[PDB]
UniProtKB/Swiss-Prot annotation, chains A, B, C, D:
The gene is adh. Belongs to the short-chain dehydrogenases/reductases (SDR) family. It comes from Lentilactobacillus kefiri. It catalyses: a secondary alcohol + NADP(+) = a ketone + NADPH + H(+); acetophenone + NADPH + H(+) = (R)-1-phenylethanol + NADP(+); 2,5-hexanedione + 2 NADPH + 2 H(+) = (2R,5R)-hexanediol + 2 NADP(+); ethyl 3-oxobutanoate + NADPH + H(+) = ethyl (R)-3-hydroxybutanoate + NADP(+). Its EC number is 1.1.1.-. This is NADP-dependent (R)-specific alcohol dehydrogenase. PANTHER family: DEHYDROGENASES, SHORT CHAIN, ESTRADIOL 17-BETA-DEHYDROGENASE 8-RELATED. Optimum pH is 7.0 with acetophenone as substrate. PROSITE patterns: ADH_SHORT. NADP-dependent (R)-specific alcohol dehydrogenase (ADH) with a broad substrate specificity, able to catalyze in vitro the stereoselective reduction of several aliphatic and aromatic ketones as well as beta-keto esters to the corresponding enantiomerically pure alcohols. The active site is at Y154. Homotetramer. Mg(2+) binds at Q250.
Length: 250, 250, 250, 250
């Protein structure tokens, strides 16, 4: 019951980290809408967690600005006022800054940065001043703290989310909106996508990358998000929560 | 049951933040030893939370090196192998660096830095390689991230705890000790000690200090510590968890 | 002679911080191209510093991608191979995240983020592997470290520049390109634009903002940039250089 | 002439980084006292740089509190009012936190932390309010930002110096003392001591440690210190200057 009465939107909630967030949110009493681009994947995902009284799928691209106010409307029609937004949708490009095409740059930032902006802006507008204990959780990454030579655009996007989220936190706090904004920074997490890339998990598990010598699992990110969505974290805003197996500590 | 089977030492556990940590740890199924310097205060504190099957007081000064191995022994005799160490004992001096006497400097660092060292060193030795999901939680502060002109020695101590804890995290991770080490960084928290200092809460509540416009409460720190003691945070090590009402975000 | 033989592009070099960078670069022996959007302003600016053997103006909007390869060509025709890129062009919007229009968001990021990307990408391509002691200096801000509730899009842009620059630094270092990339983070700096905004300097000079109790001057930023452009800083890459009167220290 | 009229104390100035700081300070017009524990080493060092009109050696252990006011007196008798303090003396212990003896802990912190405290406190007292453009430069390390599993006590000391220095910066700024305080954070630097440790330079030069693929040289640290001692950096206080070949960027 740690999220009793909460109503959450989890973007990119049909796979991996987002799916586990949705799963644990439902376990703790939240009602959840998960979004993703692909209907079959999303319908399967929602039903794996529960019925439509607690979780529903909505097809939506986080870069699709006009769809964001309809996503809130759909969620509120189902479950009542939204209390919790998890901006987790994202894509990656494996290119150095030097090698990044302008098309790649723009495509990644449209999802990873503009999408988070859209969800944060709308979340503040739709949740402020309602006594909801509202919480916006923006998914950055270890790549919001340190560079990676092969993730130039991705680093730009995660650094942007990191600091934009502080701006939003501060404005909400100063205006007594009853909305908190925080960032979560996963290290490497095992998912089917990582499993599809030969040698990725082993590279990420080297001690010079992850000191624990293995990578994490989606529930590792889910539980920090439960904390941040709950009223347990009512004094936490503007902060960065790193769950990375020691990656950034060395 | 989030801390089912855990056995925790909480130093400075008889007052304020430490007491609330102990309280929520017991609520979540841990057995707890709280320490403090004053018997009447500690006995009262323990009994306010529960009986001796779940919480006991041990009189101990965290600067007292020889008492630390006896504290572990006392805890283990009561409750079995220690799994969780919260190094929370600390003192403060209201002096600029310029105005700090060498006696003040040494006294504060003996508690705030040497005490954390003692507890961390011994915790690693006594908890490693036992499959306990062991967790050391070192209490830093917002004053481990930013300076305060009137807290020179206190800033030195909290910066030291911040980075020493990363060293310990990394060594434990690299050696597969099954011990995690993390730091918690409270902002201003309302306690009886703050209440005794006329004008302190209002000064700390100004928006230029705490953007939320009020200070926190001890349970705000307790709940992040429950997360960090639990197996929910098994991929978090070497990281800094800030609960400060936005203080460090601006 | 600290920049003897260097050839620099300084974007937004016709005003304020950029102009002072150009001025001190010329003083230390560099040849400089300054860019800006307005011809009268730029021609005046260049001639205030020196003749066309040491400084020239090129009209260019940093968001204008196709103009960037012609800017390098123009600079090299004048002065020989470019060694130093200062990505300083930028704009600001005074809006919270909540209040930012999508048009404002896109306009600011086109200059502040895409422009820095363009200059960094091209700088690496055009300066690598030539033995030039090449240096890319990306202008972030104190708003790349901390939020400001009224600068949402600006914060996103500066956080992005901060971390993207580390990616670029690392790729250049790992590949032995002989290109360094670093960020500079000015605090508040007195300029004619600040002078035009009634009450701005006094607001920025309050101790709760800038602990020194006054704001800086453009030369304060110029001298850190001279260090970073020079071979004196040949071991500095991937780092953040903060010149802010103490703003971020509290 | 970048340090014309400055009078500097450089602790641990007889070897390595400290010696190069002293060398470049003299080159730029400063008068310098270098300290160290060993007379033959210090006398040789001073004379290698210049005569007694510009550089002198004083035997002093930075942990020796009573010697610090006599060091200032000796310096002022020679050269007039001290303007610049570089707290560079330090020792290292190669032990994990777990393996650190209390004697090792205390010995290292007596030099690395107490010595910096002594020099900072006295520097503020002796240089404030004199119109000197005074500057205190505290030598931290990359080990003030990230952990190293084999440098537990050293990490504690450098984290402490990092944040204590911000306290001192802020107090000086708020009181208009005309004293700035900043930290310098070298990465790995080649010295005779590193050369004496078989395999150290190669270990430190691996790309997973230093992305540039080689370590630095003492002059790399000297030039950032010249910037910080000069009036060029009159708006820089409370900040961290990292010269590390990319170590902390990844």
């Amino acid at each position: 019951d740690r999220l009793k009465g909460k109503v959450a939107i989890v973007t990119g909630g049909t796979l991996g980290i987002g799916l586990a967030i949705a799963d644990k949110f439902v376990e703790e009493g939240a009602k959840v809408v998960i979004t993703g681009r692909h209907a079959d994947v999303g319908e399967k995902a929602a039903k794996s967690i529960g019925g439509t009284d607690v979780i529903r799928f909505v097809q939506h691209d986080a870069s699709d600005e006009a769809g964001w106010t309809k996503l809130f409307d759909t969620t509120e029609e189902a479950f009542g006022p939204v209390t919790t937004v998890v901006n987790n949708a994202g894509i990656a490009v494996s290119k150095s800054v030097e090698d990044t095409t302008t098309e790649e740059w723009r495509k990644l930032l449209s999802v990873n940065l503009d999408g988070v902006f859209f969800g944060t802006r709308l979340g503040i507008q739709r949740m402020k001043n309602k006594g909801l204990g509202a919480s916006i959780i923006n998914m950055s990454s270890i790549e919001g703290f340190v560079g990676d030579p092969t993730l130039g655009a991705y680093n730009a996007s995660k650094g942007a989310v990191r600091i934009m989220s502080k701006s939003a936190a501060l404005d909400c706090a100063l205006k007594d909106y009853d909305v908190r904004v925080n960032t979560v920074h996963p290290g490497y997490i095992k998912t089917p996508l990582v499993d599809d890339l030969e040698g990725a998990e082993e590279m990420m598990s080297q001690r010079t990358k992850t000191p624990m010598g293995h990578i994490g699992e989606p529930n590792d990110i889910a539980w920090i998000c439960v904390y941040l969505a709950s009223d347990e974290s009512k004094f936490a805003t503007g902060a960065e929560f790193v769950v990375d197996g020691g990656y950034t500590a060395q």
